[model samples]
Target: LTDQKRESIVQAAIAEFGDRGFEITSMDRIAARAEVSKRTVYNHFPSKEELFAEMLQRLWNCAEVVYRPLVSLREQLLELLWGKMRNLTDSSFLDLARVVVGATIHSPERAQVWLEETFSAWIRAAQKDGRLKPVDPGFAATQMHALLKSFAFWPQVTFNAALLTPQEQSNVVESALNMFLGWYEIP
Candidate 1:
């Protein structure tokens, strides 16, 4: 199948599922939104459940943080980590995550694996390039991700807490970068 057609369905499904909960969004609705037939959606994705999983994985995959050689590792770290944090702090993304977490809870390992590969690619590259300490890239990535979720994802999703102000986000960005670089930056 054409990538364009596949992605058209994927993008439509996201808007459909993002705006309407999984329980509410249907294959027909997504097809209608995408301007494709339900059969085509199924041909690309076996079911709505399958599409839901793909949506989460695709969302993670699309948030790539490219490595920049000219930039200081510290600058790159902040930039890359900031990109992930942006989604964490986004109210809509946070909301989508909450639903998807429940939808994919039964098979969490697969979901985490999907997230780890793309989300931590830069961290792994940094380790290889001597830009960071020899710490496990996955370990470092998880810690940084945890930090963002602690202040941004968890509180808001769990309690419907108000989102952070720009200064508060900056505080998190600075604190996380400082702690991360403090540990991983070469002496």
Candidate 2:
């Protein structure tokens, strides 16, 4: 089915991009990894950039699915923050984040696209659910997401900081949640 082939291409792209990065990764590499022809890869994604964008998009989609069930919005936000920190500690995810950040240095557009596509949806969803204030969800999401990106993602990639131990990560997540909830005062 089309969906299966699309999933295959996405999975292969993630591996290729995460392993080799955007500059070195190519359609041929993705096609080979996906067990599809280069033409098939192109058919699914017209360019390497498109494939990369889709990969990030799918990553966000997968995360959202895992994150959708927390009963309280505050808890949901904290869980999302904690989930992201946990993900950053993942070798594969960390590698991918490094690749993406490196790539973004050259292609700001793709970076913006990735952020908008991923976090924007979550913000809109949370607002609709009444878990977050009905203010500009994009603004709210951007603020919280930026904090996590800087605190968790950038630090791991840049400084090789010791991975937040379970306890430390929990404390940070709790602190961030308290501050954010205070700002929004989720009614």
Candidate 3:
């Protein structure tokens, strides 16, 4: 019951803010939309801004990508990059990105909070295990992500281009993995 109420509040906030924008959305309005009391809404979210930030963060989350010690680095990272590519090009994600991108254009600070720690942690783990070279994990992760975002994210979000074809996704992922491993993997 407790968790369900929280989910309801978040879903209501998403609908209210998504449809009406943040300027006009209020906690009382969100509580009514959620069918929860205003006090319950406050318990779940201390402030409207906090709830909005949480909503934006949740929009980008997808499947988990773990680094397995037994698996080949090639296959593990292949799965990771593929999952990221799929998420980046997904229509639902891009729709949410539209709202965020639109909002952040004016208040850039709101966009600076989250970074994908999954790939960085994966790289750092491989480095510790001697599979990859001891490069800065954060920088390495950024390089890997930038390659995919260039083809999959920017064009789709900015120009409203078509989703990447399977062939294109394959090509991009292969190229990204090759470059990353070439630079970072140890012999």
Candidate 4:
């Protein structure tokens, strides 16, 4: 099935990208890891850049599926924070984020696509729910998302700080969500 193949490709791609970083991740490596031929990898994704984009898009979609069900904006925000903490705590995700951020600084297209795919939808969803004020969704998303971004990657990626324990992650999610909701005055 195409879906099964796609899942394999994506899983392989994630592992490849997370371990090797984008520049060094080859189609051959992905194909080998996915148990598919190089031609099959190219058939699904015409280019390496396209493959990477789809991989990142899939990652964002996975996060959205998990975070999108909260009925209240407060719950949504907290869920977002918690989901991010969980993602960041994953060693693979932490490595991927570091690589993605570093790559983005050099590639405008990657940066733009990454932001649009990942954070933009959350703001749009919040606006649709009437939970956030009528500000630019992108800007609002940036403000709320940026708070977690500030703490999520730096300590681990930069300083080798310990990942937040469960209690610390919970405390962070609570405090960050409360302050964020207060700023927006979401009911």
Q: Could you tell me every candidate's TM-score relative to the true structure?
A: 0.68, 0.63, 0.74, 0.66
Per-residue lDDT of 8-94 in model 1, one digit per residue for the tens? 988887778766566678898988999998898888888766887776776565453677756797776777667777787776677
Lowest lDDT block of 10, candidate 4: 60-69
By TM-score, the candidates rank as 3, 1, 4, 2
Give the local distance difference test score of model 1. Answer: 0.75
Candidate with better TM-score, 1 vs 4: 1
Q: For model 3, how does the per-residue alpha-carbon lDDT over 1-187 read when each residue is reduced to its tens digit?
A: 7978988888888777666666577899999999999999998898866875776777756444777888799999998998888788778677666556656654566656533688999999998888998888999998999999989888887678888899998999999999989888886
Stretches off by above 4 angstroms in model 1 are 1-46, 61-64, 106-115
Ranking 2 against 3 by lDDT, winner: 3
lDDT of 4 by residue, 38-121 (tens): 998888988988876775665555354333535776766666667667887787677666556556665787778765334557
Off by over 4 Å in 2: 1-6, 64-77, 83-86, 89-91, 108-140, 158-162, 181-187
lDDT scores in order: 0.75, 0.71, 0.81, 0.71
Candidate 4 — what's its lDDT? 0.71
Select the stronger candidate by lDDT from 3 and 4.
3
The per-prediction CA RMSD against the true structure, in angstroms, equals 4.3, 5.1, 3.6, 4.7
